[PDB]
Amino acid sequence: FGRFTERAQKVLALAQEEALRLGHNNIGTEHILLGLVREGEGIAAKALQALGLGSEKIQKEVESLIGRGQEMSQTIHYTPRAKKVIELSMDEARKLGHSYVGTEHILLGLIREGEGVAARVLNNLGVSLNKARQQVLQLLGSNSNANTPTLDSLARDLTAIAKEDSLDPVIGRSKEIQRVIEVLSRRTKNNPVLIGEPGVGKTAIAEGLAQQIINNEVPEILRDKRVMTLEDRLKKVMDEIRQAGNIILFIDAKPSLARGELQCIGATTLDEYRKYIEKDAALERRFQPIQVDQPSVDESIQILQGLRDRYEAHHRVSITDDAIEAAVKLSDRYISDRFLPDKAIDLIDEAGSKVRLRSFTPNLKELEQKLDEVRKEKDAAVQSQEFEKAASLRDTEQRLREQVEDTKKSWKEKQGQEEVTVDDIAMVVSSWTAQTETDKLLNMENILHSRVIGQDEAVVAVAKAVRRARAGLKDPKRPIGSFIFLGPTGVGKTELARALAESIFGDEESMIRIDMSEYMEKHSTSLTEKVRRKPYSVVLLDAIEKAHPDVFNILLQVLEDGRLTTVDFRNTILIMTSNVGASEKDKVMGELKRAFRPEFINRIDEIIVFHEKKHLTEIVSLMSDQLTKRLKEQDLSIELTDAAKAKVAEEGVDLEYGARPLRRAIQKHVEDRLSEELLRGNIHKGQHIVLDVEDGEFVVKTTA
Amino acid sequence: EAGSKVRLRSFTPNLKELEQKLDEVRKEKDAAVQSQEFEKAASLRDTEQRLREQVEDTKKSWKEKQGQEEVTVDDIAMVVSSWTAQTETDKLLNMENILHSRVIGQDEAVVAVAKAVRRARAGLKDPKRPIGSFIFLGPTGVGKTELARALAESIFGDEESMIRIDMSEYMEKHSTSLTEKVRRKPYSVVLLDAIEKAHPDVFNILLQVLEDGRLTTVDFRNTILIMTSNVGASEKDKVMGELKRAFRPEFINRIDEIIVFHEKKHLTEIVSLMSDQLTKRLKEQDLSIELTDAAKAKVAEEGVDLEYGARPLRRAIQKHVEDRLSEELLRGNIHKGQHIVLDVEDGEFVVKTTA
Amino acid sequence: RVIEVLSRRTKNNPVLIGEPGVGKTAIAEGLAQQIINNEVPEILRDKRVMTLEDRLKKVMDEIRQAGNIILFIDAKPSLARGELQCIGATTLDEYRKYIEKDAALERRFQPIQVDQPSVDESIQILQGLRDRYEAHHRVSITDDAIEAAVKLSDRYISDRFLPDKAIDLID
């Protein structure tokens, strides 16, 4: 039912050897017992030799209670009892740290489930059940002043605990450690408080002192000193200390107070510590702080490999190195709202399962269903008996049994296909957040062009700017891009912002949009919510000419630092629109310098200017397509001929109003008309409906 | 802070490596011993202790790092600077040289401030009053603020130790300050922009600051107060006139000093400064870039228009350099960690490689 | 999405937010079934789902002392301490009012968006427990009737989750 020693495995199959040597048909607990004393060398075997139970004495009792011997041997199986007995030895070893079952555990497992034939062999051979579990025990085993009290667990001894050679690496935070020691010597602000964003690292700093005092370089009196860890036992143990003082306490979460000794290292948060020194002033006194910088990126990497081995526990890692490289780097800059050693680890785990998960996900379900009723059909008849009329049905259930197996044991065909390398690691991430990823970049223009018509002047400026920042050149703390979009309305200002979101951030809808009409007065308090919500989004502020010059002091701070105080923009693409040019490239850039404070205009990455028939009709088509899709959902199939989109487009030529009119004119010439046409009974819906122009007039046609 | 720290610089040669070595040994010895390989250890053991005594001999050679490791001042002044004399008075004697490297034109102003600070900072002015009380007159974007920064940087150590209020905010009988930011950093250039706007109430307060360098109960004796204004602007004599008429005299008279704020090759000198800040921050990301003088020229072309000045250069650098290098690295034309030069060819930008 | 948030080490413990509404509690019975037979990491096999004053730290001590446990709530926090591992069901906002507590919140526990079921999905839920509302004497059936219970609710009033509404009409 798993994997044991040879000795186990041999003793088990050895039960079968005995299954047959007597001719019986099911191997019960009595055979497992013969199995043990008959491999004569297992600890299990050894024990029995103690109680006075050779193979001779036993098999005589057993044959004296079963004997021959239907040679049937029709491919036998277990007793349900003995199957329990096996399930048990597995547990009689969890209960011993024995990572693998063996001859003893099976003997242990038999006693535990004493109801059965083995048990009686012995209660018959005058060998009560406990005298027996004893003998096995006495053949296996194991592996201090005030520590008495302390040494509950509460709260395990970092020191002697890592004196036993038993300690690993450990990677720091190497200068994080030593600052725990300037403080842990003083006589002033004596007891050090470990403040840093939670984790991991933190617990690792104290596992440091531990490592340091012991092997061995340290100073201002600190040798033979333990570091210990983790209400009706309270100050109890704490007195074993006011009477012997080789001990630092490591805390997690309170002060029963410096009534004297008490050396402790502080587990607390940026702010949580200000939940001590305010009520004061044991803080500015005893307790005293120090911060956990996020461990070195490269140090970050060789931290996992240490616990790589130990998560190998779920099946894939160890490896790949190329797999970890991911986890760590992704986090440091790509969200990017934790601490540089904790994050990475978490990611693995998503995948530190997500792969054994995806592993145990063919169409081989329905046989189970078939199989089910057969057994069922079998049962009903046997209690009706009707044997043959069923035994049919058993010979028949069983054909299907060994059937499914050879596609479930054919699923160690699936162990093989999952192996460690980045393959498994990064797919993990496709959730938590390269050829056709830089191709989006090199080919951005091609890409933005298929959505934004006309406006090549603008697209190429943005393409290149994004590509600049996105390639390493611009400072990362500042947004990806800061632009101002000048030009008339309904030209593509917003439309480009969408296409940017879609191409750059993945979703035509990952776009925050404020209307600065709302912020014209000294009430200019932003936005920061929506940016905390999605910190990866085109941030579009429409018509900034309206904002109170206050606002600019804020945006200015964003442009400079890409941060507010305390939101983050380093991942946004800020786009601010305006009518400042409008009426009107030189006369324009002029009205701009006169409308906006220069300090501001100068911190903007780029000023984009938005200036054909063929573009109108390209738009009409975009719009028309959004429509024909949302109708297909309502079982309506429509199509506009290129001739028809032309005729709609005619309705946005007048330079004065631009391309606004098109949405309305589409609903009028298409929506309104199709309704009136469906209602009047001319188009039997769910046929195919085309809108065309005939003699310069709109016409509706059908072609199912 | 120092009462362990030095006992520590004790506990920090690259003989970290020896022990590293000795390890591999035990194993061979040990693991060998499990295989035996006996005399294959005898000498192996011996090879071991050869090492060990060598180690311990140089591990106790650092009793010398003991006989070496003090106290004097320099230890402290560290501690201090990490909480916020020749090249400290040299900052003073040579202040002008120093302010000049940050503030361009404006020598009229710099020398006035240099000398004033140097007066107060030398024992002559009364210590309870700010280090310096100035008014900066002149047009916008000339260097008013810029000098205040450079002062902070040179005098107080940090181009950013500077409080800055906007007196637009204090035009009404609600004139209740500021004192927080000054309690926060009591050593900082305090810059009040456009004082022409303040309610004459405010002046009664500032006045108290100028006189006593104290409010009631904050302290300014360590600030450098600088107040700007457009009072001259439109317009040295016609100006000092519009000033006497705009500000109560009691006030103007307690101010240490009234300060007045009055090429292609400079643009490209700027482009280069900027470009250098960049090429450094990329070297960190294993990116080696260089602009030819020909290229910085072509960027500079983009800040000639007298109207907008030299603002455009930062953006145009990211566009013609950053954006382009990305697009160029991504398209796979520049195998990063080779040497990358940006040059102009036929009046157009070109990228070249020379590992 | 629960089992990721549960197979981790970082955000150990999951928390479902949506109108309350979508009988969030329904998703939880989900694990029981899959942890058993059996599609789930060997990282979680052999565990147990469960739900819910003087009986204080008593039984909770009698559990940290037994790691094989996952828990369900809708309302305390000795968080992260033991293997004390939760699954939380709490309103759109109420959670706002707990990570607002922070920051063992934003840490240990961690959320996923519960959907107001696809309208058709609604219908199927009804039938599965149709045979079980035969208790009040009139069902099973009629299908044609169920579709209404559901359908009218999504568009017509219009003040709940699309699976609670239905069953309420039915009852």
Quote the minimal CA–CA distance from C46 to chain A in Å: 13
CA distance A644 to A692: 5
Tell me which residue of B147, B5, C7 sits closest to A346, measured CA to CA. C7
Q: Which residues pair with B166 in a beta bridge?
A: B193
Residue A62 near residue A34 (C-beta atoms within 8 A): yes
**C-alpha to C-alpha distance for A446 and B273, rounded to whole angstroms:** 35
C-beta separation of A87 from A1 below 8 A: yes
Distance of alpha carbon A246 from alpha carbon A222, whole angstroms: 8
Up-side HSE of residue A388: CA atoms within 13 Å toward CB?
0
* Residues linked to residue B219 through DSSP beta bridges, in sequence order: B214
**Would you say B318 and A468 are in contact if contact means Cβ atoms under 8 Å apart?**
yes
Residues 15-54 of C with CB under 8 A from A: 38-44
- Chain A's closest residue to C35, CA to CA, is A357
Cβ of residue A465 closer than 8 Å to a chain B Cβ: yes
Enter the tokens of residue A622: 């975009």
Taking CA atoms, B195 is separated from B223, B230, C81, in Å, by 18, 9, 59
- Residue B65 tokens, joined: 């790092």
The CA–CA distances, whole Å, from A620 to A625, A632, B165 equal 8, 18, 52
Judged by a CB distance cut-off of 8 A, whether residue A163 touches chain B is: no
For chain A, say whether C3 makes contact (Cβ under 8 Å): yes
**In angstroms, rounded to a whole number, what is the distance separating the alpha carbons of residues A76 and A31?**
13
Binding-site residues from annotation of C for ATP: 18-25
Restricting to A residues 425-464, those with a Cβ less than 8 Å away from any Cβ of B are 438-439, 441-442, 461, 463-464
Count of CB atoms within 10 A of residue A120's CB? Answer: 16
Q: How far apart are CA C20 and CA C23, in angstroms?
A: 6
Decide if A198 and C107 are in contact by the 8 Å CB cutoff. yes
- CA atoms of B132 and B222, how far apart (whole Å): 9
Question: DSSP secondary-structure letter at B333?
Answer: -
Query: A353–C3: do the CB atoms touch at under 8 Å?
Result: yes
Report residue A549 as tokens.
């010059």
User: Residue A217 region, left (φ>0) first, then alpha (ψ -120 to 50), else beta?
Assistant: beta
What CA–CA distance (Å, rounded) separates B279 from B261?
A: 34
The CB-based long-range contact list for C125-129 (8 Å cut-off, 24+ gap) reads C125/C163, C125/C166, C126/C150, C126/C166, C126/C167, C126/C170
Amino acid at A239: D
Q: For residue A421, what are the CA distances in angstroms to A318, A353, B103? A: 9, 15, 56
Amino acid (one-letter) located at A93: A
Burial A242-270 (b: 16+ CB within 10 A, else e): eeeebbbbbbeeeeeeeeeebbbbbbbee
Q: Pick from B4, B287, B323: which is nearest to A465 by CB?
A: B323
Q: Is the Cβ–Cβ distance between C90 and C19 less than 8 Å? A: no
Quick check: A217 contacting B, CB < 8 Å? yes
Short-list A7, A1, A2, CA closest to A102: A7
Data resolution in angstroms: 6.9
CB pair distance less than 8 Å for A474 and B318: yes
Residue B307: which of A187, A442, A593 has the nearest Cβ? A593
Is B232 annotated as ligand-binding?
no
Q: Which two tokens stand for residue A453?
A: 């018509």
A191, A263 contact by CB (below 8 A): yes
Dump strand ranges (E) for A230-316.
Answer: 247-250, 263-268, 288-291
- Mark which residues 69-108 of C lie under 8 Å from A by CB: 103, 107
The answer to whether A525 is a known ligand-binding residue is no
Please answer whether residues C1 and C75 qualify as being in contact, where contact means their C-beta atoms are separated by less than 8 angstroms. no
Which chain C residue has its CA at the smallest distance from A231's CA?
Answer: C57
- CA A484 – CA A545 distance, rounded (Å): 11
Rounded to a whole number of angstroms, the distance between the first and last alpha carbons of chain A is 63
Of the candidates A259, A215, A267, A255, the one whose C-alpha atom is nearest the C-alpha of residue A241 is A259
Q: Which residues fall within 8 angstroms of residue A370, CB to CB, at 6 or more apart?
A: A400
Q: Which of these, C81, C12, C6, lies nearest to C44 by C-alpha position?
A: C6
| Dihedral angle computed from the Cα positions of residues A671, A672, A678 and A683, in that order, rounded to the nearest 10 degrees | -60
Look at A353 and C9 and tell me if their CB atoms are within 8 Å: no
Cis peptide bond prior to A386, omega within 30° of 0? yes
**Gyration radius (Cα) of chain C, Å:** 19
Contact B343, B289 (CB under 8 A): no
Contact list in C for residue A360 (CB cut-off 8 A) is 38-40
Which of the other chains make 3 or more beta carbon contacts under 8 angstroms with chain B? A
- Cβ atoms A551, A520 nearer than 8 A: no
A230 within 8 A of A155, measured Cβ to Cβ: yes
Residues for chain C: how many in total?
171
Cis status of the peptide bond prior to A69, with omega within 30 of 0: yes
**Phi/psi of residue B165, nearest 5 degrees:** -100, 155
Q: Could you give the dihedral angle defined by the CA atoms of residues A673, A676, A682 and A683, in that order, rounded to the nearest 10 degrees?
A: 60
